[PDB]
Amino acid sequence: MNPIIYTTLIMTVMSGTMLVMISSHWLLIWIGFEMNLLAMIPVLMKNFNPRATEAATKYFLTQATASMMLMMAIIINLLYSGQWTITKMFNPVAMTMMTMALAMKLGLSPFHFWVPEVTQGISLQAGLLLLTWQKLAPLSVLCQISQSINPNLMLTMAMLSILIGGWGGLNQTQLRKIMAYSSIAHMGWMTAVLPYNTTMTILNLLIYITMTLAMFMLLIHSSATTTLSLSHTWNKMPVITSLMMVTLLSMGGLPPLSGFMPKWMIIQEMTKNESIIMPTLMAMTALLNLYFYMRLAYSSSLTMFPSTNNMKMKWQFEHTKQMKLLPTMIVLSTLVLPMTPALSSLN
Amino acid sequence: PFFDVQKRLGLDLDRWMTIQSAEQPHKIPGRCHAFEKEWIECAHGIGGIRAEKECKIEFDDFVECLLRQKTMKRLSAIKRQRDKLIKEGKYTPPPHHLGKEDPRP
Amino acid sequence: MPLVYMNIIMAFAIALAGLLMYRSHLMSSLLCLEGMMLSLFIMSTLIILNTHFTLANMMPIILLVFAACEAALGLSLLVMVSNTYGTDYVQNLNLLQC
Amino acid sequence: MNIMLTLLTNVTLASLLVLIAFWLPQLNAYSEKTSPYECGFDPMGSARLPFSMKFFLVAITFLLFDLEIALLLPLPWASQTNNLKTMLTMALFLLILLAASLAYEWTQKGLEWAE
Amino acid sequence: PGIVELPTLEDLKVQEVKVSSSVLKAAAHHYGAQCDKPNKEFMLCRWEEKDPRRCLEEGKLVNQCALDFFRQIKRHCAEPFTEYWTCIDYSGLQLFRHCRKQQAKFDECVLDKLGWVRPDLGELSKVTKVKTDRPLPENPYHSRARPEPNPEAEGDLKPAKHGSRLFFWTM
Amino acid sequence: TMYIAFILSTIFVIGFVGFSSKPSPIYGGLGLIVSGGVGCGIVLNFGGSFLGLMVFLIYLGGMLVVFGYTTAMATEMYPEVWVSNKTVFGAFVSGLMMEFCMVYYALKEEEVEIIFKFNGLGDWVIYDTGDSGFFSEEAMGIAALYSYGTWLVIVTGWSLLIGVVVIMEITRGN
Amino acid sequence: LFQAEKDRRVLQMLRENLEEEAIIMKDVPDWKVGESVFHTTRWVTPMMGELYGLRTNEEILSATYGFIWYT
Amino acid sequence: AGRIASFLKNAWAKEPVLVASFAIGGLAIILPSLSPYTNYAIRINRATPYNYPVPLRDDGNMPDVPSHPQDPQGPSLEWLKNL
Amino acid sequence: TMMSGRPGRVPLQFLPNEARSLPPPKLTDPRLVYMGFLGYCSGLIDNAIRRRPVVSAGLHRQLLYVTSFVFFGYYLLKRQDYMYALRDHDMFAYVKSHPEDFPEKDKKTYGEILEEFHPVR
Numbered sequence A: 001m002n003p004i005i006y007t008t009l010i011m012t013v014m015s016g017t018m019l020v021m022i023s024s025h026w027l028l029i030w031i032g033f034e035m036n037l038l039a040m041i042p043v044l045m046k047n048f049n050p051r052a053t054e055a056a057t058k059y060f061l062t063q064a065t066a067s068m069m070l071m072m073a074i075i076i077n078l079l080y081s082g083q084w085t086i087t088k089m090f091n092p093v094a095m096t097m098m099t100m101a102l103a104m105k106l107g108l109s110p111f112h113f114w115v116p117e118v119t120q121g122i123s124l125q126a127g128l129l130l131l132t133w134q135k136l137a138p139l140s141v142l143c144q145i146s147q148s149i150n151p152n153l154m155l156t157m158a159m160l161s162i163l164i165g166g167w168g169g170l171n172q173t174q175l176r177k178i179m180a181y182s183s184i185a186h187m188g189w190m191t192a193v194l195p196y197n198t199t200m201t202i203l204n205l206l207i208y209i210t211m212t213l214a215m216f217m218l219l220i221h222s223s224a225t226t227t228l229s230l231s232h233t234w235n236k237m238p239v240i241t242s243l244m245m246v247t248l249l250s251m252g253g254l255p256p257l258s259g260f261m262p263k264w265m266i267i268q269e270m271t272k273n274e275s276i277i278m279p280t281l282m283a284m285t286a287l288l289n290l291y292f293y294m295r296l297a298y299s300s301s302l303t304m305f306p307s308t309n310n311m312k313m314k315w316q317f318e319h320t321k322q323m324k325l326l327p328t329m330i331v332l333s334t335l336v337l338p339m340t341p342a343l344s345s346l347n
Numbered sequence B: 001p002f003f004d005v006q007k008r009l010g011l012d013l014d015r016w017m018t019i020q021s022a023e024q025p026h027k028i029p030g031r032c033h034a035f036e037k038e039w040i041e042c043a044h045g046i047g048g049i050r051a052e053k054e055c056k057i058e059f060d061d062f063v064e065c066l067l068r069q070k071t072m073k074r075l076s077a078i079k080r081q082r083d084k085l086i087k088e089g090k091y092t093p094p095p096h097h098l099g100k101e102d103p104r105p
Numbered sequence C: 001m002p003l004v005y006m007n008i009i010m011a012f013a014i015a016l017a018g019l020l021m022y023r024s025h026l027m028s029s030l031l032c033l034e035g036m037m038l039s040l041f042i043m044s045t046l047i048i049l050n051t052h053f054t055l056a057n058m059m060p061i062i063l064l065v066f067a068a069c070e071a072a073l074g075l076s077l078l079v080m081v082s083n084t085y086g087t088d089y090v091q092n093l094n095l096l097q098c
Numbered sequence D: 001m002n003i004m005l006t007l008l009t010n011v012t013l014a015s016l017l018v019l020i021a022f023w024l025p026q027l028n029a030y031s032e033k034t035s036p037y038e039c040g041f042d043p044m045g046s047a048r049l050p051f052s053m054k055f056f057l058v059a060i061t062f063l064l065f066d067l068e069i070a071l072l073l074p075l076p077w078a079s080q081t082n083n084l085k086t087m088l089t090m091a092l093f094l095l096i097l098l099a100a101s102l103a104y105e106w107t108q109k110g111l112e113w114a115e
Numbered sequence E: 001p002g003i004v005e006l007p008t009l010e011d012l013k014v015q016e017v018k019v020s021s022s023v024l025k026a027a028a029h030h031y032g033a034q035c036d037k038p039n040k041e042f043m044l045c046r047w048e049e050k051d052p053r054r055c056l057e058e059g060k061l062v063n064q065c066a067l068d069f070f071r072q073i074k075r076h077c078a079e080p081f082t083e084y085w086t087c088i089d090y091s092g093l094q095l096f097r098h099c100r101k102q103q104a105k106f107d108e109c110v111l112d113k114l115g116w117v118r119p120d121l122g123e124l125s126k127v128t129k130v131k132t133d134r135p136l137p138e139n140p141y142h143s144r145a146r147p148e149p150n151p152e153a154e155g156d157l158k159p160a161k162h163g164s165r166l167f168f169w170t171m
Numbered sequence F: 001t002m003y004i005a006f007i008l009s010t011i012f013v014i015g016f017v018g019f020s021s022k023p024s025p026i027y028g029g030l031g032l033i034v035s036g037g038v039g040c041g042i043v044l045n046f047g048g049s050f051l052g053l054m055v056f057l058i059y060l061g062g063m064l065v066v067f068g069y070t071t072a073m074a075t076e077m078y079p080e081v082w083v084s085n086k087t088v089f090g091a092f093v094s095g096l097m098m099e100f101c102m103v104y105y106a107l108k109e110e111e112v113e114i115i116f117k118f119n120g121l122g123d124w125v126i127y128d129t130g131d132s133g134f135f136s137e138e139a140m141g142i143a144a145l146y147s148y149g150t151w152l153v154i155v156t157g158w159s160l161l162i163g164v165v166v167i168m169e170i171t172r173g174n
Numbered sequence G: 001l002f003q004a005e006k007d008r009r010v011l012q013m014l015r016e017n018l019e020e021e022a023i024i025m026k027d028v029p030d031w032k033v034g035e036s037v038f039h040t041t042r043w044v045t046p047m048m049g050e051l052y053g054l055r056t057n058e059e060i061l062s063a064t065y066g067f068i069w070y071t
Numbered sequence H: 001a002g003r004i005a006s007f008l009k010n011a012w013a014k015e016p017v018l019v020a021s022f023a024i025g026g027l028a029i030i031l032p033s034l035s036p037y038t039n040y041a042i043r044i045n046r047a048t049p050y051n052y053p054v055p056l057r058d059d060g061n062m063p064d065v066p067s068h069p070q071d072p073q074g075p076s077l078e079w080l081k082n083l
Numbered sequence I: 001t002m003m004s005g006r007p008g009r010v011p012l013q014f015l016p017n018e019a020r021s022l023p024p025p026k027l028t029d030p031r032l033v034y035m036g037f038l039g040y041c042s043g044l045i046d047n048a049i050r051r052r053p054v055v056s057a058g059l060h061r062q063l064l065y066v067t068s069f070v071f072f073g074y075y076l077l078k079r080q081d082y083m084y085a086l087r088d089h090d091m092f093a094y095v096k097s098h099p100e101d102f103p104e105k106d107k108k109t110y111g112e113i114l115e116e117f118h119p120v121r
């Protein structure tokens, strides 16, 4: 792929997402979704191999089905109201269709399998862009249409996402599948808080995006896609492993790190609405995510795995490409708990 | 979520197409232009909650104009009663309803 | 609502159920995906023509445009899969696991 | 109504011609007569096997260009508007983008058949 | 929600204009020039009242003006007008283009017998003004009272008391 | 009445049942072509002649490519027809039975589905009494894509150009 | 002229439909003849079946499809 | 100018179809912005009366609005008659 | 969304004009000092990742880190203070304009209030 073509495809993905986030018309929002998917497929297929082709095929099928359901919901809403503006939807059936379509686009359970499948299939840069941006857009649509969300359906899908992400991440050994299940669990948390505070949804989105960017860029720096490949990083550049360890501790929600702020604020907000069982279950279930984060931390930094002999040549050579904003993402993902009241600025 | 670039910059990208009571080519009116105008002017500036609570009469008239459910119920009831009456020979349609008249120009 | 809308919505539901139930071929599911947009086009134009929403008459054409863009995307992915495996069977798309 | 009657008439006439074709003449069929034709020799394979399509990219480009012609078709009515400058700008914009698509495919060798 | 009030069949009766579309189209510019006043009054009533039941008298006046116009034509130019609309009627699209000779004879007859000048191009499509005695409809849409707007922001902005008040933060 | 639109809608659903039961892409394309033509008829009866002709033409062009692709990519030794396979025939019969049951219930009584309420009456009843004059409202609204809808033209053209680029990149290989 | 003729024709059709409704729905327990389906008292255009509802199939078909089927 | 002349000579000998296509496209883009009849076309499209000219209620202070179609006030198509 | 759609809100405005009437954060704000600390930590991590001397190398780069963090932190603190002041303004306005919803209550002393006693034994 030509660099000009790649940058124009990235620009087109961002253009689709921005069209979704600036449009006041359902047709224009659907157009933005379609443009985003159309420019996103080749990004997945950039490094051509059967795994990448299969991941792109599964992603295309899922997103096409979601777009069909979304346009059906738009049409049904138009039939009963004659309105194209994105507001509270006027038909419960259309609202259910839209909720299911946006949940499928996000990867909320039980629409999650494509997330680990595609994330394993595609490279690290593709997975980073996929997770971050393709969560960025449908959450914007949901925040706009939150006041008509069915709380029962939204919270059911959110709790399912949390449980399934925890269990899948428990089982996986592949780093990309681990990141995908982490994404599923975090999306569950965000959509669980969504029907109450879109501000808390946005706060969790920002913190999750920062932590995910830091983790993916650390993986790209170490060029490790498996647990054992990451187990050799301590013998080449031990600083990256320590930074990954503190980022993993933050992503598990351990105080006083940045990952505790979204969980804390969401639990507080849901408690304000007389919800106790759901916050307690969500808090207890995240211990699975913390467990497999800790298991990954044991293999990479807290213990020394055996290495090989060509690692001496690797010692002799130095990393060339410089990650952009990696130190900033590492600092923002661990040390911004004292800056919590800025969510009012986020309001 | 919603970055109102159109409102900030004074642009009009899809607001022209959002509603059916806006500027249409050749001043072609919508089917329910009056009802949509009434509902919009009722609900303007009071928010979604108050609009749903208080402009419910205008919204119900708008939806009735859009879908014609109550009108179809009335027409079906009249048709069923007339068919039952003519089944037993208790009703005789007028010649102008039977097609034996000269309508107005 | 008249029975025409019921038939069009039922057609959309049938085409959606067809896509969600693969048999062997990806091409058959692509055809099922194309039919859903045909039903959406028909429903949208029936709604717009009945309410005289004059400026909305251009929406179904944009719908068709993005429909065939999706069809093009599906055909490209299908040719890549067929080059990889020799058949467009969805059973061969099993390298990645959940 | 009239168009439906015309279509029914045409289909009925064609079906009647087929029915006369298959019933009027004397029939005598056996295995050798109805076997597939391959210039006197038995076919080695089957006609239902895959048949490589060396112009596969041009078909997809044809789908997109069919969309383009569908967009361009309402131009005769669009020229009756008062916003002639805007309409002309948009029509020329669409045609220039279509020309750019054609030029890009031509230069990137998408119009050449597979070997 | 109320009984729809309809005019009776007795006061909907009027003397009809029983000429065909060809006859109306032949004497169309002269009709639009001669009976402009009642027709414009009726159209203004229809667009202001937005109710057919409120402008029936104007419609009856329109019918009377049309009947008087056609009677004036009949008394003076029966034959040229008959030839003109017989020429117009033959065409499927009822084109003025094919009958410029019979139209010329009809225009000559009405200009001499009645002093009528046929309007130029772009005159019948002009927007004119109407003098009426019927009052302007104050509430043509039968709107209800609009809901009272929410109170606006008042007073000057002071800093938040004790700060964020978010748990243990003192700022 | 004459139930022309209702009959066409039933035929539309039948074609959908066919290509959704999915015998083989040849017959799926045949059913989709039939459905496109019938939908053209439906929307022609409802008023949009340009829209009906356009959808019919677009789907006729689209199914041409599908035929060439299934001849090359999606063909087997014995292509499946509806009666050839038990699964395909079962799905086809299930769709036909569901459509027939819905039609019978709707005609006999005002059938209220678990999703929407449908009234059994005239598609001619639901129409409007008013009329336009010396222009087509559908044609004017569609032609308004250039005077109005400058933004839509921009995004649509950009999407088409990017689609050309994308289909070139996907099939590049290497 | 055609606007006045159309208004008179529509009003006459509505009035005779109302008379026939009064004749028909006379034994119905709860039925008010001529009752509106709208909260507003503003004039609302008859849809299609308020005029050609109790009329012959030929008239109904002409009114609802004559223009589209005329070729 | 020499490079441009050589390129045009080479293209006119190798791709006359493309040379003609680009010339026609360039003339289609540029000429409408220079012709003085574009505004005439706009005016002719404006002068076409598709719908009814709803009259205005006379307030007694409308000197530029005709009382009758044949009165001097109002738009005139005398320019279009001789065109 | 609580404060989204508030009347008179200009879209895409980080700091409106009505925020100018609030006290700006001091330059020695502890929150600003913490933002500068975050910038310094980012610079140290950058040196560590690029395998330069962590404390000594890239003084200009570390200074730019600290300065950028302080700049964005000052503006972020201004916006946060404005939003909290706006929240308090709206709350006080609603309380004042709904007296029947927020009524004053008679204050009784603990000599009048009867509280049950629970012995610890």
Ligand SMILES: CCCCCCCCCCCCCCCCCC(=O)OC[C@H](COP(=O)([O-])OCC(O)COP(=O)([O-])OC[C@@H](COC(=O)CCCCCCCCCCCCCCCCC)OC(=O)CCCCCCCCCCCCCCCCC)OC(=O)CCCCCCCCCCCCCCCCC
Residues within 6 Å of the ligand: A238, A239, A242, A243, A245, A246, A301, A302, A331, A334, A335, I040, I041, I042, I044, I045, I048, I052, I053, I054, I055, I056
């Ligand atoms: C200072 C206290 C800080 C407290 C926490 C605050 C937040 C974090 C600090 C910001 C980041 C600092 C830099 C991080 C990378 C450091 C790399 C390194 O070697 O550094 C050595 C470096 C000197 O060595 P060098 O010659 O440059 O290079 C030697 C090679 O780097 C030699 O490298 P190597 O090749 O030998 O590398 C191997 C080593 C590589 O290991 C490392 O690089 C460890 C550091 C990176 C890990 C992550 C750091 C934290 C990042 C944020 C996460 C949250 C932090 C808070 C967590 C709280 C809960 C635990 O890996 C291992 O040994 C693996 C076994 C251990 C793994 C398991 C333990 C992991 C612990 C993770 C948490 C650590 C928290 C505290 C970190 C303190 C770091 C100084 O010294 C420093 O960086 C010291 C810190 C800066 C001091 C500035 C002093 C300025 C002048 C005085 C100012 C006085 C106050 C001002 C006010 C006015 C007074 C008058």
Ligand SMILES: CCCCCCCCCCCCCCCCCC(=O)OC[C@H](COP(=O)([O-])OCC[N+](C)(C)C)OC(=O)CCCCCCCCCCCCCCCCC
Residues within 6 Å of the ligand: D016, D019, D020, D023, D024, D025, D026, D027
């Ligand atoms: C499906 C279409 C329906 C509508 C058809 C509308 C009219 C069609 C007009 C075109 C006709 C085309 C053929 C032209 C004539 C030449 C061929 C010819 O003669 O074919 C006739 C065929 C000829 O048979 P054949 O198979 O030998 O045809 C070959 C003919 N030659 C030799 C000339 C080449 O006749 C029959 O098939 C039937 C013969 C008598 C046996 C009757 C059996 C019973 C069933 C039918 C009788 C009615 C039963 C009623 C009771 C039922 C319940 C118990």
Ligand SMILES: CCCCCCCCCCCCCCCCC[C@@H](O)O[C@H](CO[C@H](O)CCCCCCCCCCCCCCC)COP(=O)(O)OCC[N+](C)(C)C
Residues within 6 Å of the ligand: A015, B011, B012, B013, B023, D083, D085, D086, D089, D093, F147, F148, F150, F151, F154, F155, F158
């Ligand atoms: C420039 C900003 C770059 C950064 C952002 C990039 C965003 C994509 C590029 C967007 C550029 C276009 C934005 C402006 C759209 C204008 C929409 C409209 O308001 O302007 C029209 C004016 O259009 C002008 O003629 C020029 C239109 C733009 C010409 C094409 C330039 C855009 C090229 C985009 C290339 C593809 C990139 C887009 C996807 C990334 C309307 O004129 P008007 O006649 O009164 O309308 C009549 C309506 N009536 C009937 C009610 C009165």
Ligand SMILES: CCCCCCCCCCCCCCCCC[C@@H](O)O[C@H](CO[C@H](O)CCCCCCCCCCCCCCC)COP(=O)(O)OCC[N+](C)(C)C
Residues within 6 Å of the ligand: A206, A336, A339, A340, A341, A342, A343, A345, A346, A347, B001, B002, B003, B004, I004, I010, I011, I012, I013, I014, I015, I076
């Ligand atoms: C007149 C000439 C001068 C004009 C001056 C310019 C006027 C302002 C121009 C603003 C930039 C131009 C537009 C660029 C995009 C605008 C982005 C921003 O400005 O918008 C604001 C948005 O600001 C940001 O949200 C605040 C950023 C806060 C970043 C930190 C988040 C808090 C994290 C908590 C932990 C903090 C850790 C420490 C961080 C370093 C509010 O816009 P709004 O239309 O209303 O948003 C709608 C969506 N809502 C309602 C749901 C919010």
Ligand SMILES: CCCCCCCC/C=C\CCCCCCCC(=O)O[C@H](COC(=O)CCCCCCC/C=C/CCCCCCCC)COP(=O)(O)OCCN
Residues within 6 Å of the ligand: D096, D099, D100, D102, D103, D106, D107, H011, H014, H015, H018, H019, H020, H021, H022, H023, H024, H025, H026, H029
């Ligand atoms: C810019 C305003 C016009 C808007 C668009 C114009 C209409 C549409 C035209 C574009 C359609 C596609 C054009 C594709 C251009 C590049 C295609 C290409 O690759 O051409 C090459 C390169 O050949 C060339 O020479 C490039 C064309 C250069 C012509 C451009 C000249 C520009 C003329 C400007 C006006 C000059 C006026 C002269 C008037 C002369 C008399 C009319 C030759 O193709 P081959 O691969 O060799 O053929 C297959 C062999 N097996």
